[PDB]
Structures are given as structure tokens and as C-alpha cells.
Amino acid sequence: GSNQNNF
Ligand SMILES: [Zn+2]
């Protein structure tokens, strides 16, 4: 799957 980090 795909991953997104929004710091
Ligand atoms: Zn993956």
C-alpha cells in the first residue's frame, strides 16, 4: 500500500 506523513 501507499504511505503519507503530514508533519
Ligand atoms: Zn506498501
Distance CA 1, CA 4 (A): 10
Around ion ligand 1, residues with a beta carbon closer than 5 Å are: 1
Distance CA 3, CA 6 (A): 10
Distance CA 1, CA 7 (A): 20
Q: What is the CA radius of gyration of the chain?
A: 7
Distance CA 2, CA 6 (A): 14
Cell 508533519, located at residue:
7
Q: How many CA atoms lie within 13 A of 1 on its CB side?
A: 2
Query: Reported resolution in A?
Result: 1.0
CA of residue 2 to ligand 1 center, whole Å: 5
CA of residue 5 to ligand 1 center, whole Å: 13
The number of angstroms, rounded, from the C-alpha of 3 to the middle of its chain's C-alpha atoms is 3
**Concatenated DSSP letters for 1-7?**
-------
